[PDB]
Amino acid sequence: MIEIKDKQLTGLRFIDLFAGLGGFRLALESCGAECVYSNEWDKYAQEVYEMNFGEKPEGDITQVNEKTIPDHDILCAGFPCQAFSISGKQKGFEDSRGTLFFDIARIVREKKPKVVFMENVKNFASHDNGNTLEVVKNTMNELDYSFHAKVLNALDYGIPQKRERIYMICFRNDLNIQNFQFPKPFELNTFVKDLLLPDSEVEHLVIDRKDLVMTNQEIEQTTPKTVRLGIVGKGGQGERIYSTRGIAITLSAYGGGIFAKTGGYLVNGKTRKLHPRECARVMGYPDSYKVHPSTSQAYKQFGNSVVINVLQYIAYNIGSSLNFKPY
DNA sequence: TCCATGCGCTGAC
DNA sequence: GTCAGGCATGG
Ligand SMILES: Nc1ncnc2c1ncn2[C@@H]1O[C@H](CSCC[C@H](N)C(=O)O)[C@@H](O)[C@H]1O
Missing domain, CATH: 3.40.50.150 (Vaccinia Virus protein VP39)
Structure with missing residues (x-):
């Protein structure tokens, strides 16, 4: 806020x-x-x-x-x-x-x-x-x-x-x-990456799916939109990975999927859900x-x-x- | 009014 | 075509 x-x-x-x-x-x-x-x-x-x-x-x-x-x-x-x-x-x-x-x-x-x-x-x-x-x-x-x-x-x-x-x-x-x-x-001047907690606090949120499929290359320039980088499973809700260089997808209360209610994000080479604190920050x-x-x-x-x-x-x-x- | 996850379609392009 | 946006069921 x-x-x-x-x-x-x-x-x-x-x-x-x-x-x-x-x-x-x-x-x-x-x-x-x-x-x-x-x-x-x-x-x-x-x-x-x-x-x-x-x-x-x-x-x-x-x-x-x-x-x-x-x-x-x-x-x-x-x-x-x-x-x-x-x-x-x-x-x-x-x-x-x-x-x-x-x-x-x-x-x-x-x-x-x-x-x-x-x-x-x-x-x-x-x-x-x-x-x-x-x-x-x-x-x-x-x-x-x-x-x-x-x-x-x-x-x-x-x-x-x-x-x-x-x-x-x-x-x-x-x-x-x-x-x-x-x-x-x-103009938006803050992106998902700017709200993330240090890696040492979210290791437990890291998910390693064997069926991960990179659909797009990580972007190097920040942008005011959601950038899907890949998917897991059939790519339904909660099975989509996005770039932290873009913006977060809308947070869900009753959603499912392996990346349930937060969605998955590519962070320093790994895919993980967001931590409750990060969710609080994306909500202001x-x-x-x-x-x-x-x-x-x-x-x-x-x-x-x-x-x-x-x-x-x-x-x-x-x-x-x-x-x-x-x- | 528990926690987890694979949907399975809907709306707006 | 592309992609973001609760229900049902298992334990
Ligand atoms: N009959 C009822 N009486 C009181 N609260 C109710 C209700 N039916 C639903 N709710 C509550 O309505 C809320 C709608 S979501 C509201 C979000 C809230 N404005 C925020 O700042 O976090 C939920 O927390 C839900 O439990």
Whole structure:
């Protein structure tokens, strides 16, 4: 994550729904905002969240009485994407994990915050011929909010990872916000190799497959894209090796393959998965953030997480708009 | 709400 | 054609 000099969100309160690792909290707090409520039902996610923030999030949001939630100015929610990912069944709203948005609507209807800040996968904008997005837009409009949505790629915001997500920002109408804008992209100057740990700390992650097949030669010039160098097995998900001179592929939470949830990388002549810490760095998490003791749960959590830097730029712009109150 | 891995198709080219 | 992006099942 980066450092924010002008704390645009100072004095504002927000709630951390579907908290997970707490990426939204890190981002909003870096801007001076105060967290007054968090919710997450995963046991292991609750443990890591408590390790880094000192409090346990409330459980299953579907069984929480919205009136119970503390007044707040901004509602943050990176809700479940498994039902919308192109890698799954795309049942969307017909999936038990695809209805959480309505829980969000339910909370908004009661608390009416100034801002609703949501996140999901890129496919959310196209899912079901765009009906899924329209449903969200209309729901928010009927709740008396403006709706701003855009897919952003982490690689355009200083992070060496290809992670395209849809960001949806909504301002309550009585605030008359007409100047909100998604941050503009900029040149990437950091690559996977620059975030790697020393070889002496990841020897155990090295994988030596006899069926490795180099499909491309290692490049010598860094580039803002994923560069596949080869594959193992049939080359499916988790069986693809990439160059550290390029950017990391998107981290997976439920993915498989021999290089499961991180993908494989060519490092100093050897192929290996990424270490939890490296996963934290590709997600913009500061080295001071404590990862969950179970590496398996750590990979899962980062796979589901958001990129801190992208949320920071957006949070700053939300604040910039809320603070423009000329006479 | 355990950990591991071979898929087996989908969306955007 | 090229390639990035959870489910099912075994222990
Ligand atoms: N009914 C529910 N109540 C509370 N949390 C839920 C839920 N259904 C799913 N979740 C949680 O929703 C999260 C979606 S992924 C969220 C990532 C998070 N924003 C980050 O910063 O790391 C997961 O951690 C998952 O366990």
